[PDB]
Amino acid sequence: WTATSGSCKGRCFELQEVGPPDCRCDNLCKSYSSCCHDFDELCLKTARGWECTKDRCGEVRNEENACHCSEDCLSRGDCCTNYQVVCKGESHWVDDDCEEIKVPECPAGFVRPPLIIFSVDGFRASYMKKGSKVMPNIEKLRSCGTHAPYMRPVYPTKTFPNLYTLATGLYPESHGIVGNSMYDPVFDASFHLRGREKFNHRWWGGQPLWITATKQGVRAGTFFWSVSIPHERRILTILQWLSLPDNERPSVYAFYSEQPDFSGHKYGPFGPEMTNPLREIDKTVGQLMDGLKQLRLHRCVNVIFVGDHGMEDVTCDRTEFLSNYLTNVDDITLVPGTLGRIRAKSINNSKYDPKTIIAALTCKKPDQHFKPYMKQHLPKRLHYANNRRIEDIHLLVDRRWHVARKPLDVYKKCFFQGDHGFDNKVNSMQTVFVGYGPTFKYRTKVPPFENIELYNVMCDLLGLKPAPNNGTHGSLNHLLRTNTFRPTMPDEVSRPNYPGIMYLQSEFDLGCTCDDKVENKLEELNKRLHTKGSTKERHLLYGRPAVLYRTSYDILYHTDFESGYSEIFLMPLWTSYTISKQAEVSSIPEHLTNCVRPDVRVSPGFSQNCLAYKNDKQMSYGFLFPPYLSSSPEAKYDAFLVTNMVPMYPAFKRVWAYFQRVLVKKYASERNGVNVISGPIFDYNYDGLRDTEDEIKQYVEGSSIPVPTHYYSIITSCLDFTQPADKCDGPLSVSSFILPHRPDNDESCNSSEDESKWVEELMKMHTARVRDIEHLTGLDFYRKTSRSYSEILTLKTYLHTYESEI
Ligand SMILES: *[C@@H]1O[C@H](CO)[C@@H](O[C@@H]2O[C@H](CO)[C@@H](O[C@@H]3O[C@H](CO[C@H]4O[C@H](CO)[C@@H](O)[C@H](O[C@H]5O[C@H](CO)[C@@H](O)[C@H](O)[C@@H]5O[C@H]5O[C@H](CO)[C@@H](O)[C@H](O)[C@@H]5O)[C@@H]4O)[C@@H](O)[C@H](O[C@H]4O[C@H](CO)[C@@H](O)[C@H](O)[C@@H]4O[C@H]4O[C@H](CO)[C@@H](O)[C@H](O)[C@@H]4O)[C@@H]3O)[C@H](O)[C@H]2NC(C)=O)[C@H](O)[C@H]1NC(C)=O
Ligand SMILES: Cc1cc(C)c(C(C)(C)CCOC(=O)C(C)(C)C)c(O)c1
Ligand SMILES: [Ca+2]
Ligand code: NA
Ligand code: NA
Ligand SMILES: [Zn+2]
Numbered sequence: 109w110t111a112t113s114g115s116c117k118g119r120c121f122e123l124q125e126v127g128p129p130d131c132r133c134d135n136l137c138k139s140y141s142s143c144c145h146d147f148d149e150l151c152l153k154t155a156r157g158w159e160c161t162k163d164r165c166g167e168v169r170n171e172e173n174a175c176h177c178s179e180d181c182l183s184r185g186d187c188c189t190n191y192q193v194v195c196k197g198e199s200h201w202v203d204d205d206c207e208e209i210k211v212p213e214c215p216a217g218f219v220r221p222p223l224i225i226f227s228v229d230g231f232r233a234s235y236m237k238k239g240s241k242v243m244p245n246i247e248k249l250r251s252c253g254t255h256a257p258y259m260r261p262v263y264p265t266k267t268f269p270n271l272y273t274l275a276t277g278l279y280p281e282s283h284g285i286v287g288n289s290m291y292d293p294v295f296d297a298s299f300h301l302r303g304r305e306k307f308n309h310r311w312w313g314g315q316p317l318w319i320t321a322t323k324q325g326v327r328a329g330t331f332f333w334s335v336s337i338p339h340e341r342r343i344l345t346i347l348q349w350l351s352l353p354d355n356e357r358p359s360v361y362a363f364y365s366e367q368p369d370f371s372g373h374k375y376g377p378f379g380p381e382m383t384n385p386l387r388e389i390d391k392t393v394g395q396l397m398d399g400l401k402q403l404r405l406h407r408c409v410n411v412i413f414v415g416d417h418g419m420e421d422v423t424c425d426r427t428e429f430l431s432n433y434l435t436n437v438d439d440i441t442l443v444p445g446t447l448g449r450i451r452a453k454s455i456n457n458s459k460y461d462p463k464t465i466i467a468a469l470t471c472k473k474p475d476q477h478f479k480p481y482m483k484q485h486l487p488k489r490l491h492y493a494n495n496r497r498i499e500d501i502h503l504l505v506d507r508r509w510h511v512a513r514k515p516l517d518v519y520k521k522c523f524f525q526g527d528h529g530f531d532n533k534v535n536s537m538q539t540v541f542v543g544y545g546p547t548f549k550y551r552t553k554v555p556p557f558e559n560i561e562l563y564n565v566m567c568d569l570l571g572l573k574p575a576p577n578n579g580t581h582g583s584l585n586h587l588l589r590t591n592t593f594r595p596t597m598p599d600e601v602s603r604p605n606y607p608g609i610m611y612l613q614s615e616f617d618l619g620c621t622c623d624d625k626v627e628n629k630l631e632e633l634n635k636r637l638h639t640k641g642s643t644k645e646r647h648l649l650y651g652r653p654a655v656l657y658r659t660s661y662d663i664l665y666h667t668d669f670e671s672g673y674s675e676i677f678l679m680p681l682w683t684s685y686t687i688s689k690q691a692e693v694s695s696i697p698e699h700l701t702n703c704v705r706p707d708v709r710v711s712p713g714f715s716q717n718c719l720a721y722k723n724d725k726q727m728s729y730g731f732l733f734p735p736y737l738s739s740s741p742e743a744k745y746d747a748f749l750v751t752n753m754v755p756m757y758p759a760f761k762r763v764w765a766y767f768q769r770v771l772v773k774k775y776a777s778e779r780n781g782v783n784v785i786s787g788p789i790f791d792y793n794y795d796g797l798r799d800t801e802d803e804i805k806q807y808v809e810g811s812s813i814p815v816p817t818h819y820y821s822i823i824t825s826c827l828d829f830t831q832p833a834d835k836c837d838g839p840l841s842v843s844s845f846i847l848p849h850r851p852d853n854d855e856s857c858n859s860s861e862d863e864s865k866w867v868e869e870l871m872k873m874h875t876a877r878v879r880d881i882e883h884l885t886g887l888d889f890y891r892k893t894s895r896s897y898s899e900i901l902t903l904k905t906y907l908h909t910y911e912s913e914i
Contacts, residue, residue, distance in 0.1 A: 635667070
């Protein structure tokens, strides 16, 4: 109930929330069906439209009018945004040359540059170039301020997950808004775009920027707008708030536009109908900047122009139907469209089986346009598993397509030409970022980055301490003239042991054999020097990784590679090696096919054993430093040490062997050498974070050898590829992956073919940031370079996407 009989007089667009049942006068009262009886009359005036005309200049004030052109309007803060242009001879902001804003130029009483976030739904990144001719205000922001060529949304590339990620810095699995539609099995409640459940605060996790600001005494404008409030009124309300007395005035403001998404769904991303929505958004930017100019705030405010996601061409005819795969289609509930999520229709049905559903959906039709995954097997870069609202079965749908349960859902539940939601590396899903104002840089292009990083920067712009989030604070310092956040590298928690030769061969009873016993003064000294680290500068290029948790581990040096060997997990945490452009690939010699060698620096008790692999009929092993890339026949023996061995399913060894034997040398040829760091990952609870020893669900049969969920590699070279990776003077270039360690290659429909036709495709799908590997391993990389720390933070957030040019 709401007592709608109260009044909005003197309260229009009031900032504090009045609790039930008193009626409301704020931005969102319409959405809550709670506005006072007189809200439209007093607060949504429309008389005489939105623009001054020559004949209104100097007019006697009529409070009925939507905005004013009377001589008192500037003191009242309610002029039409074009007032000074029409009545006072001024220029539109867009017509002024851009001039660097070196310092804020703010009116007296302003404690900090205000932040205005101007958000656009469905604004695909390529609109900034493709629509530039019809968006002069936006083009001026972009060209004169700081801009990225695009900004990467979060998965799923839907509106509410992305808007809330912008506001919180968190992945959807952490903030809880994992889709526009959700079922939470603990609440037994459904969240939808339609209806009241979505208003319950229990859905909304983390801490959004307006709450961060408020808790730290920085006032925020009301954070969002009821859809029926016209854009012109939203801009006028923001400008009105900016004229409040100092003690009452917000420091952070948000505008949101439902366009171009609304038309893009109807017309497709480049429908000819799309020009007009782009012009109308540009005109709204122009109203804002003109309004700011009138208030003398156009060289004071920081403006962020940012979108939530792009828009792809999708039509009704490109729909896959689960009814063409499943016999039991009425026993499941599907959340449909550009992603699929499947769960049992009834919790009382004991004949629901997820394995049979996945199997029936796997590589069943030649051009099949979706792929099923259990959620833990989704690419780790999606960070889309650790929430009870994310169903165990997920369908990744190809761009341009939909999935639905049955055909009747598509015509009795056609018209649309655009949609979004797909994998957040897809080019059509990328969106926009421009920052303009005194705290942003001038005429500066920055590389693409992810929208999870912006919350920290918005906090930086407001002088706020961010709530804990998934950005990497400092990684976006290059967007900023001032207010940078200067992080310190985390402290190493565990220091390594450096074992020498401590064990004789016969102390080992590992069940391993090797044909290595065929036989000096200076030659033996030389190999003693390798074991003490004499080649470590060549193979450990950026320092050893720091271990940021408590554990017991050994550094092991070799001619061709260096490792940090865990005494607890019985394998390396990391193995580091450099491969020059000139390196040569060799075979594993016949007499060494099954060679595994005890490591006389590591006790039998802290070693793997070969008998466990013999007896585990599902599990084989591989090596982290590749035997194929040994520098000499003699150095090759080091690659068969038991301290370089890791458990690998035979299906995964197909993938791993091709990467090691073919791809590493390809990357070294293309990049002028590469440095590789490889290792295992254990994430059995799919939380994106390193497992402790007691979270491990699978061991090599009969042993304490834990089985990795994933294997990673970080592949670094010189950004200026005229310098070899091992003699690089400047910025670095990286690409990395986190490959699922699976017992089959059912993900790869073409896996019966030669690895050359499918392995690299698999690897590209599981591309990763160095930071993702950091979270999964408790390691900290790039500790010793000549590069600034914020630059290394940006390198660690880089994702190699393999999409062609935007
Ligand atoms: C991205 O960044 C985010 C933010 O930094 C990272 O998420 C953090 O990671 C931590 C580890 O996973 C996690 O820490 C836990 O917090 C528990 C208290 O949680 C509440 O309080 C906080 C603070 O206000 C709040 O933010 C939380 O919000 C979560 O839960 C609510 C529901 O109440 C949701 O609305 C909200 O969206 C969010 O859910 C998300 O996180 C939870 C986990 O908290 C997931 O389950 C969800 O799926 C979703 O992802 C909460 O309101 C605290 O109790 C935990 O402590 C346990 O474990 C530690 C281990 O150190 C142990 O010491 C304790 O004994 C304790 O164990 C006991 O509980 C166990 C579980 O029941 C039990 O088995 C034991 O036997 C014990 O009884 C723990 O500290 C932190 O909450 C989240 N924060 C957020 C916002 O998500 C994220 O990791 C980053 N991602 C990556 C990849 O880097
Ligand atoms: C301060 C501030 C900051 C940010 C980032 C926004 C945006 C633009 C992104 C929108 C957030 O809306 C959400 O989160 C929903 C709850 C509506 C899904 C805002 O309104 C206000
Ligand atoms: Ca984990
Ligand atoms: Na085996
Ligand atoms: Na396959
Ligand atoms: Zn949309």
